[PDB]
Amino acid sequence: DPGFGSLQRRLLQQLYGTLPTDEKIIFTYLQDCQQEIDRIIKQSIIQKESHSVILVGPRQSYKTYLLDYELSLLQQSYKEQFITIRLNGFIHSEQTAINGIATQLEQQLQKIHTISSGSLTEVFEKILLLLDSITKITVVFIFDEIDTFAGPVRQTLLYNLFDMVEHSRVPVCIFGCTTKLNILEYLEKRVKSRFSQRVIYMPQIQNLDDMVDAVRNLLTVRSEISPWVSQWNETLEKELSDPRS
Amino acid sequence: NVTTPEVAFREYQTNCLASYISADPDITPSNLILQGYSGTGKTYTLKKYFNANPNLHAVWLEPVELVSWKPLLQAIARTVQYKLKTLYPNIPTTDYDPLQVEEPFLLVKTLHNIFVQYESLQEKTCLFLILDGFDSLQDLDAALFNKYIKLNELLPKDSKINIKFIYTMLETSFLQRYSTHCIPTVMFPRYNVDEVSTILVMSRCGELMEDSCLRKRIIEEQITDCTDDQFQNVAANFIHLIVQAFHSYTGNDIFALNDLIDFKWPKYVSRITKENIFEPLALYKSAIKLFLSTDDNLSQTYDLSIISKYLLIASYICSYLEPRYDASIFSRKNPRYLQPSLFAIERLLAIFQAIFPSLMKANIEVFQNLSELHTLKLIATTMNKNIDYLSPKVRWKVNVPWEIIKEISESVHFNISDYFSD
Amino acid sequence: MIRLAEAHAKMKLKNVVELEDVQEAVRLIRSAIKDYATDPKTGKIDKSVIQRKLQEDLSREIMNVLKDQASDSMSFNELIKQINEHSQDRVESSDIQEALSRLQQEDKVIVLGEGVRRSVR
Amino acid sequence: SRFENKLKTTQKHQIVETIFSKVKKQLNSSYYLPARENEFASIYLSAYSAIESDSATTIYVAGTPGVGKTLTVREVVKELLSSDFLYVEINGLKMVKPTDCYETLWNKVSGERLTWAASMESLEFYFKRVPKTIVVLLDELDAMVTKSQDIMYNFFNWTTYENAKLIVIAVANTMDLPERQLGNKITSRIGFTRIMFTGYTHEELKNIIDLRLKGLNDSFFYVDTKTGNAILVRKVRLRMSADAIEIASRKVASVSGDARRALKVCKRAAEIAEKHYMAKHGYGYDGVQTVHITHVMKALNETLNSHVITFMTRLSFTAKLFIYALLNLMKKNGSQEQELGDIVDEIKLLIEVNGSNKFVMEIAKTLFQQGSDNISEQLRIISWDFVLNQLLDAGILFKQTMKNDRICCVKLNISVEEAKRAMNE
Numbered sequence A: 001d002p003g004f005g006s007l008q009r010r011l012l013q014q015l016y017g018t019l020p021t022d023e024k025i026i027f028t029y030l031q032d033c034q035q036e037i038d039r040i041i042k043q044s045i046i047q048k049e050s051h052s053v054i055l056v057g058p059r060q061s062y063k064t065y066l067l068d069y070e071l072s073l074l075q076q077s078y079k080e081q082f083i084t085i086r087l088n089g090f091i092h093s094e095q096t097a098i099n100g101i102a103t104q105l106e107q108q109l110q111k112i113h114t115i116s117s118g119s120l121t122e123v124f125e126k127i128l129l130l131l132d133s134i135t136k137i138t139v140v141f142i143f144d145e146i147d148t149f150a151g152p153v154r155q156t157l158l159y160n161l162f163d164m165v166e167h168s169r170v171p172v173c174i175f176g177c178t179t180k181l182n183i184l185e186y187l188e189k190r191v192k193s194r195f196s197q198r199v200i201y202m203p204q205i206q207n208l209d210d211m212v213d214a215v216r217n218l219l220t221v222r223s224e225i226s227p228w229v230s231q232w233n234e235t236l237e238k239e240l241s242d243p244r245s
Numbered sequence B: 001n002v003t004t005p006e007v008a009f010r011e012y013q014t015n016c017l018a019s020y021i022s023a024d025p026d027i028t029p030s031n032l033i034l035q036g037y038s039g040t041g042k043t044y045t046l047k048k049y050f051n052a053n054p055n056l057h058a059v060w061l062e063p064v065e066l067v068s069w070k071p072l073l074q075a076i077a078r079t080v081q082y083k084l085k086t087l088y089p090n091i092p093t094t095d096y097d098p099l100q101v102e103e104p105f106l107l108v109k110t111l112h113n114i115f116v117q118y119e120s121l122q123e124k125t126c127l128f129l130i131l132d133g134f135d136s137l138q139d140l141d142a143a144l145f146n147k148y149i150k151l152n153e154l155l156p157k158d159s160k161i162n163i164k165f166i167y168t169m170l171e172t173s174f175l176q177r178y179s180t181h182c183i184p185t186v187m188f189p190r191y192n193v194d195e196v197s198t199i200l201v202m203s204r205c206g207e208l209m210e211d212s213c214l215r216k217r218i219i220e221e222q223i224t225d226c227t228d229d230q231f232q233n234v235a236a237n238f239i240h241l242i243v244q245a246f247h248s249y250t251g252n253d254i255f256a257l258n259d260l261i262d263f264k265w266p267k268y269v270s271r272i273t274k275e276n277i278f279e280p281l282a283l284y285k286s287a288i289k290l291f292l293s294t295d296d297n298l299s300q301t302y303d304l305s306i307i308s309k310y311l312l313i314a315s316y317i318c319s320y321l322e323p324r325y326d327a328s329i330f331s332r333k334n335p336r337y338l339q340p341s342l343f344a345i346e347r348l349l350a351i352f353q354a355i356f357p358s359l360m361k362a363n364i365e366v367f368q369n370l371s372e373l374h375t376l377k378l379i380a381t382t383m384n385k386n387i388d389y390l391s392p393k394v395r396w397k398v399n400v401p402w403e404i405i406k407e408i409s410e411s412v413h414f415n416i417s418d419y420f421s422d
Numbered sequence C: 001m002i003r004l005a006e007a008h009a010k011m012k013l014k015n016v017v018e019l020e021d022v023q024e025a026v027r028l029i030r031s032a033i034k035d036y037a038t039d040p041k042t043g044k045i046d047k048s049v050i051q052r053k054l055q056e057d058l059s060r061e062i063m064n065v066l067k068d069q070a071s072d073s074m075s076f077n078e079l080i081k082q083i084n085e086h087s088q089d090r091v092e093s094s095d096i097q098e099a100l101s102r103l104q105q106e107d108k109v110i111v112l113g114e115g116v117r118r119s120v121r
Numbered sequence D: 001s002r003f004e005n006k007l008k009t010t011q012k013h014q015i016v017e018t019i020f021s022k023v024k025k026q027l028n029s030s031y032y033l034p035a036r037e038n039e040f041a042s043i044y045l046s047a048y049s050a051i052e053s054d055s056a057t058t059i060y061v062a063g064t065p066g067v068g069k070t071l072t073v074r075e076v077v078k079e080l081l082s083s084d085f086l087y088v089e090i091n092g093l094k095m096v097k098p099t100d101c102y103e104t105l106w107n108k109v110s111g112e113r114l115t116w117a118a119s120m121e122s123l124e125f126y127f128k129r130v131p132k133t134i135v136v137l138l139d140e141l142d143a144m145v146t147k148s149q150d151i152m153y154n155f156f157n158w159t160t161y162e163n164a165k166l167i168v169i170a171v172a173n174t175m176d177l178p179e180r181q182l183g184n185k186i187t188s189r190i191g192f193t194r195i196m197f198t199g200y201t202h203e204e205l206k207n208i209i210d211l212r213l214k215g216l217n218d219s220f221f222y223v224d225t226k227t228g229n230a231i232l233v234r235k236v237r238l239r240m241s242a243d244a245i246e247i248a249s250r251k252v253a254s255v256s257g258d259a260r261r262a263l264k265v266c267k268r269a270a271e272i273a274e275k276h277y278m279a280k281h282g283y284g285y286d287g288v289q290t291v292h293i294t295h296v297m298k299a300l301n302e303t304l305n306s307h308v309i310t311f312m313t314r315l316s317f318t319a320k321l322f323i324y325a326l327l328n329l330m331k332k333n334g335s336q337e338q339e340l341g342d343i344v345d346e347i348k349l350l351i352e353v354n355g356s357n358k359f360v361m362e363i364a365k366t367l368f369q370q371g372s373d374n375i376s377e378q379l380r381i382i383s384w385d386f387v388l389n390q391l392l393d394a395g396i397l398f399k400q401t402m403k404n405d406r407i408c409c410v411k412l413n414i415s416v417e418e419a420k421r422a423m424n425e
């Protein structure tokens, strides 16, 4: 029957979170944090702050998930108010990261309405003079495994970006994702000092009951797609309720 | 909504694979790990799944035919662009140089440039890029698996087309290094013996019932015209026989068996007659002389000469006799198992001149045959291949096992059981 | 074990060896050896995490029982025979005492006189 | 320049500005100074002598970041701007390659794009040929001088020339930099004329704070109670209680005494109070205010406390088991280095030392097979690979690389003591 296929579609696209952004259901045990992030990000876009921050927590901690949740949520609200730039630490070496910035910047400008031209040195100085310098566009960054930049050798790119945080009139924002709990000691004196010293640890599930409630959130559907949705959710809560099931 | 095929021993895996993969790019996860050791038919169950579901779109790569990640990237680029050119002939396109990409980020930029133009698509469609054996890349490092995991994120989220990978790997000692990513994965355990036989027979009857040699010997012997089943019976019987007789030697492989079968089928055919076709028993009792030895080998009385024999047999003497004792047990008045210790030149010459049967002092043929040996890699040097023939720090060690030593001793009639004492 | 358990039973003037009279024999033989598994050198510089988990799972199970046992009151001994005897060897049951003491602090149950043990409303 | 307009858009619906927002806005890290007063004048007169008399010298300055030295030299060369010179911020940590400085130089001299070779050729040419003073900011010199000092060798052998139209204002991190990597011959040309920058006293910190709060200290805004907007509908006032400022200055001057750290922690407490005030009234983002000591107390404590303890108190029971076993091994062998398979053996111990208790039975079952006796008899515990990794990448645990996973070593990066304490909670 069509209904069962439709309901399976709904449940599956939920269990990837691929629902439309307004329908995503974020777990309670971390709401505040994204709330904490929400301000941190929205007042960095609307009120044009320029503060940096580092999310930290183990893998599979929804870091990029919370980030893209916020960005999508803002997209429908403030479409052109900003641009987004993500430079994964893994694939982007310290030198390739420059070209990454350049290219993502140019193809964001071509979406909001010559940069990659030149050599690595030239494109780097170009992005410098471009950023460092009615409203002004804010440019939000996202780093995955930012720690890989923070090798003992250079720690250059982080330094330059935190300098942008410190100086540039364009209100920038940085969301470093990583996993090294003692991320700070990696950052050198110059880098640490540049850094706003604000790092938010991501929470973990502290109570069995919290995980039960998280499963409840995930599995539950909130509208009628197939006639069984009521039957579905009632069977759901039945099986999830009894501590002997 | 997809047609899950059926495989003789992949029921759970077929179901879970069709569950982790569908048309909808939304409910389709980013990556996937078909894991399991070589001999479980991953490259076959996956193919026999795709051929059941042709509406979707995939690309097939052979990471073993490539060598490094550079050709890997370049091949990914060229295959993707050609696959799209051949998937939608109508859309105009500007092909980007697949030989231009040399960095993992160059790949992402190129793919973005390739996908932004396909935005005239009618619906979000998936594209499953299959890497067949991402483990066996000859230059693997810790920092490659994640390098390929993360490409989902860099690429735009709302592109009309969605690249989704399917990695294939073995040696769970590798997949363990990436558990915390919690990427969905399926495992293929190796088969038991019986199911091995089942797969093997149902896959090789088509080869053996209609091969050239058996059909030939049909008319080459009394005709005894018969139905197809008689050949089925005899072939399947030979199959069960060879597998049940060589299992303990081959393990649960499917390829090794697919080699033994072809190495031992022609002779077995030769040993059939007019009568045994209805009698597998006597057929076995007649062809026995092969069922009991691999004969997979295709102690030599080495060409080397007397002076070489003595050179080698003396250079073997300090695989147990350190220079602490030689000047005692050889004067002019167990490490048989372990890897040999290192000689030094002019000790070899010493023991040689000792146990050569004052008779000889010339050393031109001696060193001549020494270089001969070193070209035969019987007494190799731990040091380099060019400066050995100086006298810098350089050690020599035998690379012949003890049986050839017994042989050389008996043939030269010199005895060696003496110098080893414990 | 045998020559020593029969001596223990000789003590207390017991005429026949019981079952709960070889147990202290085992204890005594284990006086020397209690603390090493593959390598010697006992060491053992004497609340553990695995003890935490033991108390926790006991709490889980006993709450589930007492909420499934509608007659909310039962003795500690009755409760032991209800759970600690269903299967393999009995437990200290003073760790059960700590469990129920926690359930008094947390107030998930109420001893309510030594004779029984009730839960909370 | 060209792309600057490309960052300016129009859709802006009267962004709401609350009180603490304005505060942090002037409290920004960008906009005479009290802390460095005699240093200001000293470097001012150094450059005055070097330029107004048309000579060339080397002004070395060193000290930890955040002492204002970048701002201080900028103030000096800014007052000098009003009275020949090219302020060329050659930051080694901004140079993509080490040699790239040359090109900037090689550009700022003529505006040409060639290699570093011809760059320095024409540079020295200009330094010894041109008939007759350009302040090149050698920011964070360390990066440039790492390979074999050839870079700084050049950068100062240029300076040593007499008629060289070349003043350098070098800033390094540490004082002994010229005496630990630079060549002795180089060290001499560097000279003994280096100005040191001390830390900052909490007095100076108060000064800089009230400076940033000059026009805003204890001042009045005109705040509409409906929207939370602030204008420098009730005329509210705000006081920034200088006692919290005092305690923050004291704490920072204690360990570091850095302007950046102090500014930022002040901003942090400010925005904390801001979010509390916003929550208490819910203005969203479209009588009298103060900042209690408790705000700065929280904001400052958060800059010291770690999380490793509060983290390990939240790991999976498997992880805690692993760690506790590792600690038993550390004290049993006194080696603070264990073998991985040995740890597995110890976990087996710890599971079996307790009796056949039904609860130990459940533990054994699950930890070795998630129930479902159908599949059972695991060699090493479930998720063991997974939890090992979840630890390792988290920087807690630290392991060498041998594909043989029974003799590979393992070591705690954190202190044993704090780990034990974490086990005790």
Ligand SMILES: Nc1ncnc2c1ncn2[C@@H]1O[C@H](COP(=O)(O)OP(=O)(O)OP(O)(O)=S)[C@@H](O)[C@H]1O
Residues within 6 Å of the ligand: A016, A017, A018, A058, A059, A060, A061, A062, A063, A064, A065, A066, A144, A145, A177, A178
């Ligand atoms: N495109 C996506 N849409 C929705 N959820 C996603 C997406 N990609 C990943 N996730 C979720 O992200 C969660 C894991 O967090 P991620 O941020 O993706 O990875 P992480 O380990 O938490 O941090 P990273 O990504 O490794 S730096 C999982 O629950 C995934 O379901």
Ligand SMILES: Nc1ncnc2c1ncn2[C@@H]1O[C@H](COP(=O)(O)OP(=O)(O)OP(O)(O)=S)[C@@H](O)[C@H]1O
Residues within 6 Å of the ligand: B007, B008, B009, B010, B036, B037, B038, B039, B040, B041, B042, B043, B044, B045, B133, B199, B203, B254
């Ligand atoms: N269930 C099956 N049904 C039919 N044939 C099978 C089955 N399983 C394995 N085979 C055969 O065994 C072969 C082994 O396939 P492969 O996937 O190459 O083996 P493998 O484990 O992948 O090792 P590789 O090739 O190095 S990845 C297949 O090509 C089939 O011919």
Ligand SMILES: Nc1ncnc2c1ncn2[C@@H]1O[C@H](COP(=O)(O)OP(=O)(O)OP(O)(O)=S)[C@@H](O)[C@H]1O
Residues within 6 Å of the ligand: A190, A193, D028, D029, D030, D033, D034, D035, D036, D064, D065, D066, D067, D068, D069, D070, D071, D072, D140, D208, D259, D260
């Ligand atoms: N006297 C002051 N008045 C106002 N703000 C100050 C003062 N001193 C320092 N600051 C602030 O603190 C920052 C410290 O920057 P600087 O110390 O000049 O840079 P730095 O010492 O060179 O650090 P680097 O660049 O990593 S070596 C300044 O940019 C101001 O934001």
